[PDB]
């Protein structure tokens, strides 16, 4: 029964880890899109 | 006297009375835009590194 609580612990842990990874991924996406747009318009 | 007479002669050869419509503005403008692109990318990299430090910090 304690292993269920262990499961819930690690589930909450990587829930938070996945949301932080989503924020990192969104900021990288936006930086790539901005770089490509700004460099596309220079010509 | 020789140097100043020679330079007044040379200035007589290359004077026009017209205000020289050439410039270098567009290249400075493009260089400023390139530098501000670099600055924008620097700020965004600081933000991504800060979120990475928040993730690894726990």
Rounded CA-CA distance B31/B48 in Å is 26
User: What is the stated resolution of the deposited model, in angstroms?
Assistant: 4.4
Mutation for testing the A interface, residue in B30, B34, B43, B51 having most A CBs under 10 Å? B51
CA-based R_g, chain A, Å: 19
In terms of phi and psi (left: phi > 0; alpha: psi -120 to 50; beta: otherwise), the region of B22 is beta
Rounded CA-CA distance B48/A33 in Å is 15
Q: How was this structure determined?
A: cryo-EM
Nearest to B48 among A27, A35, A39 (CB): A27
> Contact B51/A27 with Cβ under 8 angstroms?
yes
């Amino acid at each position: 029964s304690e292993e269920r609580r262990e499961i819930a612990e690690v589930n909450k842990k990587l829930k938070q880890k996945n949301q932080q990874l989503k924020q990192i991924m969104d900021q990288l996406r936006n930086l790539i899109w901005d770089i490509n747009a700004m460099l596309a318009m220079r010509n | 006297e020789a140097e100043l007479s020679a330079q007044i002669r040379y200035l007589t050869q290359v004077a026009t009375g017209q205000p020289h419509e050439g410039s270098s503005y567009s290249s400075r403008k493009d260089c400023q835009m390139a530098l501000k692109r670099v600055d924008y990318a620097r700020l965004k990299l600081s933000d991504v590194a800060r979120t990475c430090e928040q993730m690894l910090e726990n």
